[PDB]
Paper text:
The lipase from Proteus mirabilis is a particularly promising catalyst for biodiesel synthesis as it produces high yields of methyl esters even in the presence of large amounts of water and expresses very well in Escherichia coli. However, since the Proteus mirabilis lipase is only moderately stable and methanol tolerant, these properties need to be improved before the enzyme can be used industrially.
The structure of Dieselzyme 4 was determined by x-ray crystallography to examine the effects of the mutations on the PML structure. Mutation of leucine to isoleucine at position 64 provides more interactions with side-chains F40 and F60, possibly improving packing to stabilize helix α2. Loop mutations G202E, K208N, and G266S and are located close to the Ca2+ binding site which is essential for lipase stability and activity. The most striking change in the loop is a direct result of the G202E mutation. The introduced glutamate side chain at position 202 is positioned ~4 Å from R220 in an orientation that could form a new salt-bridge which may provide stability in the low dielectric methanol environment. In order to make this potential new salt-bridge, the helical region between residues 203 and 207 seen in wild-type PML partially unravels and may increase flexibility of the loop region to allow new interactions to occur.
Author numbering: 1 to 287
């Protein structure tokens, strides 16, 4: 069961593989190709708007469609990636077979909102300020070797705020939940939409691998700062919703759902198998 249309993995941290030394979707393109699927990876700019990432993505896809002569692509995006995918699907539906959003910031990130308030010097209790700053420094240091300037992250997190995703969502409403925390239509203008998510949970005798992953400790701290108690450290469970829900109750953090860092995840969960099973599902729908 390989897909009719090529899979395009989409993320919003262009430069990751060059700076960090391994792919953002850790182990995923390899496993999908072992299974017979055509796989591309689109790495889009972190420091740009969602619209501008969507335009970069279209240029990427137009380019691969010329060569595969396949007409359409199946997008699999994580975090900011789905917003760029949504842009291409809304604009160029005849070129998009599906959009699959994995822990997408589809309605905004409470942590991005909080970081913005910090940079604006709103009155935030200092203990909250330190939790955010220290988690970001730990994440940024784990991947890049430097903790960064806290104004380093601004250009990136701005496009993930509830404000800026709301504005995006007004222009590109396709497949968005109607009800608070609902599902969207599976098919809009011929494009199939699917979503996956996860949230941090205290269950038994994990977390195993993740005990060695500094990003997981950062996510666990960030998790405590949200009004939405079910979240993945960066995005609240309901904010991830787009199109048809597949599964959103994995006990995983935001990074874990891309098998990071370096395959350190909770509970010896096989994250790559989430992606390979989903590819077979897409193929099963003649995509
Ligand atoms: Ca992890
Ligand atoms: Cl990458």
């Amino acid at each position: 069961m390989s897909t009719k249309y090529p899979i395009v993995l989409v993320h919003g941290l262009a430069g990751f593989s060059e700076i960090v030394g391994f792919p953002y979707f850790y182990g995923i393109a390899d496993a999908l190709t072992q299974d017979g699927h055509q796989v591309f990876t689109a790495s889009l700019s972190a420091f740009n708007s969602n619209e501008v990432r969507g335009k970069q993505l279209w240029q990427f896809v137009q380019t691969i469609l010329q060569e595969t002569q396949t007409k359409k692509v199946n997008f699999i995006g994580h975090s900011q990636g789905p917003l760029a995918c949504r842009y291409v699907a809304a604009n160029y539906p005849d070129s998009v077979a599906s959009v699959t959003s994995i822990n997408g910031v589809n309605h905004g990130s409470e942590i991005a909102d909080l970081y913005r308030r910090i940079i604006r010097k709103d009155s935030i209790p200092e203990y909250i300020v330190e939790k955010v700053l220290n988690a970001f420094g730990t994440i940024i240091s784990t991947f890049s070797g430097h903790r960064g300037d806290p104004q380093d992250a601004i250009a990136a997190l701005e496009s993930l705020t509830t404000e800026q995703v709301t504005e995006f969502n007004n222009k590109y409403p396709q497949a968005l939940p109607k009800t608070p925390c609902g599902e969207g239509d599976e098919i809009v203008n011929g494009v199939h939409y699917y979503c996956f998510g996860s949230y941090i949970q205290e269950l038994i005798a994990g977390e195993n691998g993740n005990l060695l992953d500094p990003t997981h400790a950062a996510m666990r701290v960030l998790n405590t700062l949200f009004t939405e108690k079910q979240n993945d450290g960066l995005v609240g469970r309901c904010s991830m919703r787009l199109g048809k829900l597949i599964k959103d109750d994995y006990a995983q953090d935001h990074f874990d759902m891309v098998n990071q860092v370096a395959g350190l995840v909770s509970y010896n969960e096989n994250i790559v198998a989430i992606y390979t099973l989903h590819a077979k599902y897409l193929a099963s729908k003649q995509l």
